[PDB]
C-alpha cells in the first residue's frame, strides 16, 4: 500500500524502485490576450523518475509539441507521464526493471496502473510523504536541459553526484529532500546558501557544489534554518 514515515527504510533496500513525480510535466504561463481574455502558453516540462537508492534520475523532457492540438491537457499529462514511464521500464533490461513504482501524486495511480498492465508484478504505490520533487526545476542544470530542448529527449543524471562514495543512500536522500524542500520554500535564499562561497564550484559532471563533509553540515544547517524561518512567516508562529 502507501509509502509513509513507518516504512521509510524500504526506499534504501535492494529491491529496485523508482519514484515518479509528474508535477513538472505540464507547465504553463498564464497571460492576457489582446481582447483581455486569459490564455496559457505551455513551456517544456519533464518527468522526474528517480531511483532513491542509486540516485539515477531518468529526466524525460516533455517538449511543448506533445500538447499541440490536444484537449484537457492536465488530464493528458498524467497519461503521457504513465506512457513514458511504461516506455522507460520496457527499455530497461529485465534485471534493471523496478519491482515498485511510487507516484508522488495519487492521480497518477490509475494512469500508471493501466499503462503497466503488461507488468502485473510491478507494484504501483502512492506515498503519504510530501516529497519536494516539484523543486527539481530549481536545479539549474536540470532547468537548463528542459528549457533548451527542441524535441522529446531523455537525459540521465545522478541526482546525488558522488555523495554515495562517502554517505549511505538514506543520508543522500535526506540531503536531497532537504535541499529540494529549501529550494521549494525560498528558492532565492536556498541558491544564495549553495553558491555564496565562490571557491566551492559545481563540477562539470555534477548538479550540486563540491562540499567537504564539514561544509555539507554547515549547508544542511543553513537549509534547515531557511525552512523553519519561512514556516514561522507562512503561519505566524
Amino acid at each position: 500500500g502507501a509509502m509513509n514515515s513507518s516504512n521509510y527504510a524500504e526506499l534504501f533496500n535492494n529491491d529496485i524502485k523508482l519514484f515518479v513525480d509528474d508535477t513538472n510535466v505540464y507547465r504553463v504561463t498564464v497571460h492576457k490576450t489582446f481582447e483581455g481574455n486569459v490564455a496559457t502558453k505551455a513551456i517544456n516540462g519533464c518527468i522526474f523518475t528517480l531511483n532513491p537508492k542509486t540516485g539515477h534520475l531518468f529526466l524525460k523532457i516533455i517538449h511543448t509539441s506533445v500538447w499541440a492540438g490536444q484537449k484537457r491537457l492536465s488530464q493528458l499529462a498524467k497519461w503521457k507521464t504513465a506512457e513514458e514511464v511504461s516506455a522507460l521500464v520496457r527499455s530497461l533490461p529485465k534485471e534493471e526493471q523496478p519491482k515498485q513504482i511510487i507516484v508522488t501524486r495519487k492521480a497518477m495511480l490509475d494512469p500508471l496502473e493501466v499503462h503497466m498492465l503488461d507488468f502485473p508484478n510491478i507494484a504501483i504505490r502512492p506515498t503519504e510523504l510530501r516529497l519536494p520533487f516539484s523543486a527539481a526545476m530549481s536545479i539549474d542544470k536540470l532547468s537548463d536541459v528542459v528549457m533548451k530542448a527542441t524535441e522529446p529527449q531523455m537525459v540521465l543524471f545522478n541526482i546525488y553526484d558522488d555523495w554515495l562514495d562517502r554517505i549511505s543512500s538514506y543520508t543522500a536522500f535526506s540531503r536531497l529532500t532537504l535541499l529540494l524542500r529549501a529550494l521549494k520554500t525560498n528558492e532565492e535564499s536556498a541558491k544564495m546558501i549553495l553558491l555564496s562561497d565562490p571557491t566551492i564550484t559545481i563540477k562539470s559532471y555534477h548538479l550540486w557544489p563540491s562540499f567537504t563533509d564539514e561544509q555539507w553540515i554547515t549547508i544542511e544547517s543553513q537549509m534547515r534554518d531557511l525552512i523553519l524561518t519561512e514556516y514561522g512567516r507562512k503561519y505566524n508562529v
Binding site: 497519461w79 504513465a82 506512457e83 490509475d110 494512469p111 496502473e113 493501466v114 498492465l117
Partner: protein, 300 residues
C-alpha cells in the same frame, strides 16, 4: 397457469415467489403455489424463521418441466425437484387444488412489474451462470461467490457471471490506454456485446439476473456484477440509442421494486452518482434519474 406443489412445510419459513412473499408456520398444511404465469422465469425463495441467515432459492421456468418443493431434514432446506411422471404430478396438483391448500400467485392484471424485471432473463442463460446441468432449475443463495470474487473458492457452487474489470488487458487495447480507460465503448461494444454476449438482450438478461440475486438473496457478488454492467454502459460515450432507452426502463423498474430499507447495502453511492451526474450517459437515463432523486435523494 402452472403449479409448484410442496410435499409439506415442516419448518416455519418465509416463502418468496418472485416479488411476493408469505409466512408459513411449522407443519402448516401448505401444499404450494398455483396460477404461476407462463412465459417468464420465476424464483421461489426461502428464509427460515429460526435462521434468517442464508436466503436461498430456485430459478425455474414451468415450461421446462414439472417442479415441486420438498423439505430435506438431513440438509435442512426446502429443495426443488423435478417430477418426471406427468400423471402423478397432475394428480398431486389436482388433489392439493381441490383441498385449496395452495396460495395463488397474486398478480394484479395491470401489473407488469415481474415482466419488467425479467424481460431479458432466460433460463438457458441462468443455467450457464449457475452450473448444475443435471437440473432444469438453478439454486442460488446469499453466500455463493462469483468467479470474479474467487479470482481475488469451490468452483462448482460459483456464480459464473461474465468477468468485467476496467483495469484489465481485456478492457484496454495496447496503445489506447487513456482512450479505452476514459471511454469504455471499445470494451462495451467490441469485447462484451459483439464478442462475449453476442447481443444487448443477453447483456441485459445477465444484468437483470444479477440484480434479482442481489435483491432476493442479498448476494453481494451479484450486486457487484449489476453495478459493473451499469457502469460499463454509462462509462461508454458510444452506446446504441435503443440500449440506452432500454437500460433506463430496466433500471427504473429495479429501483422501483427495491425495498426502501435495503438502499443502504444494495446501491453503490459512487456508481450511481457517477452514472447519473458525471458519466457520458448522465442525461440518457431520465426515468431512472427521476425515480432515484425522488426515492433515494440521500444516496445522491
Amino acid at each position: 397457469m402452472n403449479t409448484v406443489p410442496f410435499t409439506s412445510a415442516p419448518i416455519e419459513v418465509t416463502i418468496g415467489i418472485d416479488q411476493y412473499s408469505f409466512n408459513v408456520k411449522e407443519n402448516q398444511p401448505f401444499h404450494g403455489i398455483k396460477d404461476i404465469p407462463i412465459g417468464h422465469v420465476h424464483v421461489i425463495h426461502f428464509q427460515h424463521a429460526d435462521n434468517s441467515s442464508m436466503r436461498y432459492g430456485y430459478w425455474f421456468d414451468c415450461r421446462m418441466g414439472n417442479f415441486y418443493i420438498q423439505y430435506d431434514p438431513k440438509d435442512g432446506l426446502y429443495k426443488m425437484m423435478e417430477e418426471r411422471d406427468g400423471a402423478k404430478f397432475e394428480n398431486i396438483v389436482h388433489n392439493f387444488k381441490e383441498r385449496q391448500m395452495m396460495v395463488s400467485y397474486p398478480k394484479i392484471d395491470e401489473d407488469d412489474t415481474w415482466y419488467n424485471l425479467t424481460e431479458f432473463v432466460q433460463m438457458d442463460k441462468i443455467r450457464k451462470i449457475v452450473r448444475k446441468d443435471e437440473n432444469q432449475f438453478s439454486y442460488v443463495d446469499s453466500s455463493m461467490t462469483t468467479v470474479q470474487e474467487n479470482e481475488l473458492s469451490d468452483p462448482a457452487h460459483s456464480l459464473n457471471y461474465t468477468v468485467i474489470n476496467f483495469k484489465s488487458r481485456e478492457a484496454i487495447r495496447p496503445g489506447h490506454e487513456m482512450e479505452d480507460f476514459l471511454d469504455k465503448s471499445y470494451y462495451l461494444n467490441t469485447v462484451m456485446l459483439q464478442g462475449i454476449f453476442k447481443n444487448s438482450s443477453n447483456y441485459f438478461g445477465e444484468l437483470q439476473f444479477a440484480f434479482l440475486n442481489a435483491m432476493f438473496f442479498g448476494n453481494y457478488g451479484s450486486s457487484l456484477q449489476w453495478h459493473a454492467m451499469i457502469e460499463l454502459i454509462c462509462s461508454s460515450a458510444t452506446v446504441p440509442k435503443h440500449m440506452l432507452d432500454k437500460l433506463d426502463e430496466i433500471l427504473y423498474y429495479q429501483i422501483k421494486t427495491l425495498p426502501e430499507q435495503y438502499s443502504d447495502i444494495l446501491l453503490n453511492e459512487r456508481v450511481w452518482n457517477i452514472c447519473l451526474y458525471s458519466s457520458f450517459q448522465k442525461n440518457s437515463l431520465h426515468n431512472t434519474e427521476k425515480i432515484m432523486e425522488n426515492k433515494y435523494p440521500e444516496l445522491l
